[PDB]
RNA sequence: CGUCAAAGCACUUUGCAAAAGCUAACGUAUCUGUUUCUUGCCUUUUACCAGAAACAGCCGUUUGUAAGGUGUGCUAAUUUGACUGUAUAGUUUUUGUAAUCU
């Protein structure tokens, strides 16, 4: 992940993305040390929302605006700046708006069941259309 | 003396390798037994030599081909035709073995 | 041939003897490849029987 | 996974190279005479101990004059003195230099020694006649 | 070849074979090659006739065989596999 | 040769035993000792001559005579797994090269 | 060989023909007798070999990684070391609180000092037991090498410095931890580090190099280490449970 | 491919052939070839009758050769 | 009144839900399998034991059948694919592919031909040593099962329409049409000589249809009220007695439902934890078989 | 040549250019069409001669025949016990509530 | 290399089961504990000393198999296994010394 000024230089196309990536970074930072106002669970969201905002930069910049180079894509999968297996849900379809991936797995839920975001809107009533608690996710269905 | 068991343990003792079942070989035993009894192809002879000079190596040669369930060991020689533990122990033949 | 590591040489030159190996065979230790070389070059050991 | 791996022969004959402070240079097995497992097994068994080995207890300590009688058998009266046996002799052939032969190990009797000599330099070709073999020269037969 | 091996096998035993001209030989087979070419002693030539004859040594060619009666006991020869680079039925402990 | 194949030799030819000599471990001559081919086959060929001598020291007789060229001398390297003689290679080189 | 299965780190002795060979000549006593008690130690495992036995497999990290409650991720080695050591911390702080003896000072580097005068009371109450003692100085031993790496992180030491530093805290557990006193059977590692110091320390110091600090060559010490670890890992379990 | 026929025991020795269509020619074999091609000297040749006309130095096609045979005991 | 040791025998096994359970022709063997992709073996009279474990199928088994040489086996998976287990020695012989979904349904000839249906509404015909699909009939809708007339030249195929289609594979003239039902044909069944058709819907009512060349019309001979289906939409079987006098089937309310195929209803005996999934009767006693899914299966009288 | 592998240890009658028969137990073939009989009858022309094991030249042979075929599960989780049927007060469809 | 056959394949996560049969490294590495004995130091216990026997535990390894994940394919890729695998009208078999009658 951290690289030294000694370390071997990244593909071309990666000096200029490298100031986005770095303020992505900071406020990470930033959310780490903000505390207070949520339960247990709540003052977590903001951290996979930014994960997702980060990764989604990324793959936007591959695979609809063509601006970077397959080897630095890859370089950058493989340095941890953008979740590989996320990207690959997001590849298919249903899943091309996913929050995160504890909004899909069934075994951490209490009946085995994926997160509320994942429902389409339309199959779901006024009242039971709330934040996620995984994440603060406000709909994943790909339909909304 | 205490030593003594009241009740033996069953102890069988096991002197050579000795398989319990016959190996399947890549020819037929009667065909074999055949060439014994009623042929003129058969040669009596001894490989003998000097010290760790090759003479069991030889035999294995032979065996490995003639019983293809034989694989060599993993760290030494297969040495067939030793059988006896203690010559598995010094490595070293030491009796006549046919 | 065996030993020093010249997996093309050796292929072409068993290819000429109708010696064919696997390809994960070439990547063996030495001794092993020499065995399964001679034995596929010199088979039964006839000219001792 | 890292479960197995295949290395080329210049990767291995480097690896050879740089790392050669801190392997062996015997490859011959011979030079544990008397100082390899088994003897070792065979050492503490007899309570003996080669001087360069380790010292053990004594594994067997039923030897009190409960017979009370020397047994007129090693008596010195009745006994040709050529040379001492040393407790090498009684650890090479456990079986035959002394009574009371039990729990020994045998060891491996003797190996093939190795004529290698690697080469000095490279410039040699690998094929070449070493001036410490002793020359094929024995007009000193009579054949058929 | 698996028959070439067989006639190999026969060697040093007494084998029947009838030529082209339909005469039989009963002797003793001494050698053979890949071609069937063979080595006979104390032949009784029975003619196509019946007239039987006698010889001691012969060098049948193999181009003239029709068949050959091999000893029984032959039935239980081992038949090996053989591999494409392989000229002689052996048993094989390589690849292949 | 060592003093215990002598040994053996001495008691063979003595009971008019016939003997068929095979030089093993001819591998050590490649990949050990790395003699040149040439080197390697004087220690072949001195190796043979040692032998015919510790049988001519019994009996002068030709019958008891160990020569490659007689069929009676085999090649092996038991560990590598072949053991050839002149004639193994020759019928080696007509299978593959015809007649 | 050119082919083989990557074993683990501190399954590579890397010395072991150093003193499976004879002893070099000339070599003082200590040297000598070193060579000779690891020659002894080897002996003995050797002698005692069993063939292992079968069984299914069981991993307790697999087990834990089941379950919802654990969840997994990649961190830096030496973020993962002062989290561990944090960790530990505070589980021994809460363990001191819940009992009343929140007179007892357990400071950064493991020490259970009173902060007060203590009566009889006090004494025989805040006494604690073997296992709480010897995971504390695990606990230290494990917060002095993160402690290190960490000097070298900052930039206080460079890379020999933390190599000779490491050495030094293998080979001197017994003066820096105090944690044979709660299991005496330690000193059998004690021993067998100081004979590898002597081992390597004469094989190191020849020649133009000489006496002083330095020698960085870590390794056995740290697998001898790390082997003690193993057979005490399931006893602390057992005494702590 | 092809092989040589082993025949160095019966080189330069009394020899007698039996050719296609019951022919019967006597010689000393002087030479082989891969066809097995004979080579045959100072000859002499059999007739259904019987009588013996010398017929000289002999080169048999080896296709025709039915057998070759040796009396010697 | 049997051979039986126990007049009831409930059987346990399997990891999840069995879908089908079908008698050996001779009457001795019977084989069931289900959702835990394993087919099992059983022993009618005697200790009742499993002797084999068909492992290998990498689906689940919608339906199994039984060879007349009783020697073979013929699966039907949810995986796209018809196996053919050899019971003696328990390996794959073949596997026909060549649908493009799940396989619903399976039956066998009196002849070596095999008939199947699949949700990419076609129905295929295959040898048993062909490996590939001699005729295939596509439909618009998917179907749901099938059977075959020991005769040799008619199958019934029943699906989503709610009408049974009668082709003959020869003519493939399709324009006669066993109308009647409303709702999905879950399972259909040939009478012992091969002239009466019976038929389950979940539309609730179980009906009986006539096989033969010439009707008087209205071909409907009776129906059967009181066998029902649930909301899982399982397909629930029907099945003939040896001397086709009783008619079986199963209904998601854990009740098998047995009548005498004069209207009057005989047996509705529980005993089900789950939706009963199939029902048959041994060829020579008066055994019955239940299928369910709650894992387990009983032996009848 | 693969269907040649599959008439081994059959017994095939083989007609000759000759003219005679030939019944026995095919061992093994070549690719000239030697065949090994075992077992082997003569035709002539029909008298019966045993003859026994036979090598036939390749040129002999003109046709063949075979005459007779060649000669010549582990375990399971269920466990069955005895039981009743336990009628449920209850009618209504496991879905249905 | 070639022919044939069936299996998507490569990497990877987890579950389940097994791992000496013919004397031999599941692990070329190496800890701990219990019981019964014999010892050492010993004021009494823990902690200990160092040898044995019989048992266990922990750190690891290999294989089989089941269900998945990632990347690429099914408009082909790869792997595994099997194979009595090769030319050729010019004498030793397959591009005819045949027909004729008897
Ligand atoms: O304790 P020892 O093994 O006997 O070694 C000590 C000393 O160790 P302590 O500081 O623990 O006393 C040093 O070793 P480190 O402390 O450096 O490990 C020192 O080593 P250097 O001189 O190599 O720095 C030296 O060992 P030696 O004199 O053998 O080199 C010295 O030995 P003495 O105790 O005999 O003085
Ligand atoms: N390098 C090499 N080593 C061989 C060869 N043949 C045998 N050896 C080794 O020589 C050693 C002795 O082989 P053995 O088969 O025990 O020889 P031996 O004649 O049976 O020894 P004794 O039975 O005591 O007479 C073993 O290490 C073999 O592996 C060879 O051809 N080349
Ligand atoms: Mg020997
Ligand atoms: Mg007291
Ligand atoms: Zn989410
Ligand atoms: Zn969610
Ligand atoms: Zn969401």
């Known amino acids: ?144 | 003396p205490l030593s003594q068991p009241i009740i033996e343990p069953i102890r069988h003792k096991r002197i050579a390798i000795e398989t319990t079942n016959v190996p399947d070989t890549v020819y037929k035993k009667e065909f074999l037994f055949g060439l014994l009894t009623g042929t003129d192809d058969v040669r009596s002879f001894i490989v003998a030599g000097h010290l760790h000079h090759g003479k069991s190596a030889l035999l294995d040669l032979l065996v490995y081909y003639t019983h293809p369930d034989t694989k060599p060991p993993k760290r030494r020689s297969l040495r067939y035709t030793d059988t006896h533990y203690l010559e598995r122990e010094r490595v070293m033949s030491i009796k006549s073995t046919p | 041939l065996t030993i020093s590591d010249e997996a093309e040489k050796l292929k072409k030159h068993l290819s000429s003897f109708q010696i064919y190996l696997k390809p994960k065979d070439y990547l063996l230790d030495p001794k092993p490849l020499l065995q399964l070389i001679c034995a596929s070059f010199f088979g039964f050991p006839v000219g001792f029987v | 996974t890292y479960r197995r791996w295949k290395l080329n022969l210049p990767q291995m004959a480097n690896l050879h190279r740089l790392g050669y402070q801190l392997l062996s240079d015997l490859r011959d097995d011979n030079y544990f005479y008397l100082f390899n497992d088994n003897s070792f097994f065979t050492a503490k068994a007899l309570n003996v101990a080669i001087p360069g080995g380790p010292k053990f207890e004594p594994l067997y300590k039923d030897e009190a004059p409960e017979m009370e009688d020397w047994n007129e058998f090693n008596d010195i009266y009745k006994l040709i003195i050529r040379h001492p046996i040393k407790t090498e002799y009684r650890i090479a052939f456990p079986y035959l230099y002394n009574s009371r032969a039990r729990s020994v190990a045998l060891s491996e009797y003797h190996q093939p020694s190795n004529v290698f000599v690697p080469p000095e330099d490279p410039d040699l070709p690998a094929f070449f006649w070493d001036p410490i073999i002793n020359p094929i020269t024995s007009r000193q037969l009579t054949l058929h | 070849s698996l028959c070439i091996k067989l006639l190999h096998e026969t060697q040093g035993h007494i084998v029947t074979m009838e030529l082209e001209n339909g005469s039989t030989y009963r002797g003793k087979l001494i050698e053979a090659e890949d071609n069937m070419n063979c080595q006979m002693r104390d032949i009784s030539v029975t003619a196509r006739d019946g007239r039987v004859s006698h010889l001691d040594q012969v060098y049948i060619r193999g181009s003239h065989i029709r068949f050959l009666i091999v000893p029984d006991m032959l039935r239980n020869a081992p038949m090996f596999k053989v591999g494409p680079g392989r000229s002689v039925p052996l048993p094989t402990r390589g690849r292949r | 040769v060592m003093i215990n194949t002598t040994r053996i030799i001495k008691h063979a030819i003595l009971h008019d035993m016939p003997i068929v000599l095979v030089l093993n471990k001819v591998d050590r001559l490649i990949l050990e000792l790395r003699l040149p081919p040439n080197d390697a086959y004087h220690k072949l060929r001195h190796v043979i001559d040692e032998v015919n001598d510790n049988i001519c020291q019994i009996s002068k007789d030709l019958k008891y005579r160990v020569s490659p060229e007689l069929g009676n001398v085999c090649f092996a390297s038991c560990d590598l797994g072949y053991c050839f003689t002149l004639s193994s290679f020759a019928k080696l080189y007509i299978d593959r090269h015809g007649g | ?241 | ?73 | ?301 | 040549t693969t269907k040649m592998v599959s008439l081994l240890n059959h017994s095939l009658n083989v007609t000759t250019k000759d003219g005679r028969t030939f019944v026995g137990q095919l061992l093994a073939f070549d690719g000239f069409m030697n065949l090994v009989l075992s077992d082997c009858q003569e035709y002539r022309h029909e008298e019966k001669r045993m003859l026994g094991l036979v090598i036939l030249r390749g040129e002999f042979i003109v046709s063949l025949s075979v005459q007779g075929p060649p000669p010549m599960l582990l375990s399971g989780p269920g466990v069955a016990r005895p039981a009743g049927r336990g009628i449920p007060l209850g009618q209504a469809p496991v879905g249905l509530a």
């Open chain 1, 1 to 144: 992940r951290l690289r030294t000024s000694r370390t071997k230089r990244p593909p071309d196309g990666f000096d200029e993305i490298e100031p986005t990536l770095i303020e992505f970074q900071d406020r990470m930072r930033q959310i780490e040390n903000t505390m207070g106002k949520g339960t247990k669970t709540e003052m977590l969201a903001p951290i996979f929302q930014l994960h997702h905002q980060r990764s989604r930069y990324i793959y936007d910049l591959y695979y609809k605006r063509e601006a970077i180079s397959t080897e630095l894509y890859n370089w950058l999968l493989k340095q941890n700046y953008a979740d590989g297996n996320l990207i690959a849900k997001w590849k298919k379809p249903g899943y091309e708006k996913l929050c995160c991936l504890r909004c899909i797995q069934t075994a951490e839920s209490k009946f085995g069941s994926t997160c509320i975001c994942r429902v389409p809107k339309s199959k779901l009533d006024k009242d039971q259309r709330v934040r996620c608690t995984h994440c603060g996710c406000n709909g994943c269905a790909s339909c909304d």
């Open chain 7, 1 to 241: 060989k050119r082919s083989g299965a990557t074993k683990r780190a501190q399954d590579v002795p890397l010395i072991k023909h150093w003193y499976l060979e004879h002893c070099p000549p000339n070599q003082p006593v200590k040297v000598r007798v070193s060579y000779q008690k690891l020659l002894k130690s080897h002996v003995m495992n050797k002698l005692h070999m069993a063939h292992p036995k079968s069984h299914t497999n069981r991993s307790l990290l697999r087990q834990l990684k089941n379950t919802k409650f654990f969840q997994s991720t990649s961190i830096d080695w030496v973020e993962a070391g002062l989290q561990v050591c944090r960790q530990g911390y505070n589980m021994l702080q809460l363990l001191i609180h819940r009992k009343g003896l929140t007179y007892l000072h357990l400071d950064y580097n493991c020490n259970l000092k009173p902060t007060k005068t203590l009566t009889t009371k006090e004494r025989k109450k805040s006494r604690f037991g073997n296992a709480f003692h010897l995971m504390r100085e695990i606990l230290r031993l494990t917060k002095l090498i993160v402690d290190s790496h960490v000097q070298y992180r900052l930039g206080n030491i460079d890379a020999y410095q933390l190599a000779d530093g490491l050495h030094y805290i293998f080979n001197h557990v017994g003066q820096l931890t105090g944690m044979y006193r709660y299991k005496y059977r330690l000193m059998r590692q004690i021993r067998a580090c100081k004979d590898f110091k002597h081992l390597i320390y004469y094989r190191f110091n020849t020649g133009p190099v000489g006496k002083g600090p330095g020698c960085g060559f870590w390794a056995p010490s740290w697998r001898v280490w790390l082997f003690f670890l193993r057979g005490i890992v399931p006893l602390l379990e057992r005494w702590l449970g």
């Open chain 8, 1 to 73: 491919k092809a092989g040589a026929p082993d025949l160095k025991k019966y080189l330069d020795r009394q020899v007698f052939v039996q050719l296609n269509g019951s022919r019967k020619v006597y010689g000393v074999l002087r030479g082989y070839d891969i066809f097995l091609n004979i080579v045959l000297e100072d000859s002499i040749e059999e007739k259904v009758d019987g009588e013996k006309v010398k017929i000289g130095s002999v080169a048999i096609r080896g296709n025709s050769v039915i057998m070759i045979e040796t009396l010697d005991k």
């Open chain 9, 1 to 301: 009144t049997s051979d039986l040791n126990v007049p009831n025998l409930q059987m346990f096994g399997h990891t999840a839900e069995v879908l089908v359970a079908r008698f050996d022709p001779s009457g001795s063997y019977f084989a069931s399998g289900g959702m835990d992709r394993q087919i099992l073996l059983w022993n009618v009279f005697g200790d009742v034991k499993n002797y084999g474990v068909l492992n290998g199928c990498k689906g689940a088994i919608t339906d199994l059948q039984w060879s007349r040489d009783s020697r073979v086996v013929y699966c039907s998976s949810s995986d796209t694919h018809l196996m053919s287990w050899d019971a003696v020695s328990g390996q794959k012989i073949r596997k026909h592919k060549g649908h493009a979904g799940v396989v619903n349904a399976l039956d066998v000839l009196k002849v070596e031909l095999l008939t199947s249906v699949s949700d990419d509404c076609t129905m295929k015909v295959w040898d048993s040593r062909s490996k590939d699909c001699i005729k295939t009939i596509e439909e618009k809708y998917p179907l749901t099962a099938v059977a075959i007339a020991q005769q040799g030249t008619q199958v019934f195929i029943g699906g989503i329409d709610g009408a049974i289609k009668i082709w003959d594979l020869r003519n493939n003239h399709c324009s006669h049409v066993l109308k009647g039902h409303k709702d999905i044909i879950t399972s259909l069944a040939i009478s012992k000589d091969g002239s009466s058709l019976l038929s389950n819907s979940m539309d609730n009512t179980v009906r009986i249809f006539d096989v033969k060349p010439f009707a008087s019309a209205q071909r409907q001979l009776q129906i059967f009220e009181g066998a029902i289906h649930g909301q899982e939409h399982n397909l629930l079987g029907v099945a003939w007695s040896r001397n086709s006098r009783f008619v079986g089937a199963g209904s998601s309310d854990k009740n098998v439902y047995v009548w005498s195929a004069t209207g009057d209803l005989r047996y509705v005996l529980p005993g089900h934890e789950g939706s009963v999934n199939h029902v048959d009767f041994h060829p020579h006693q008066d055994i019955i078989l239940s299928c369910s899914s709650d894992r387990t299966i009983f032996l009848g009288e």
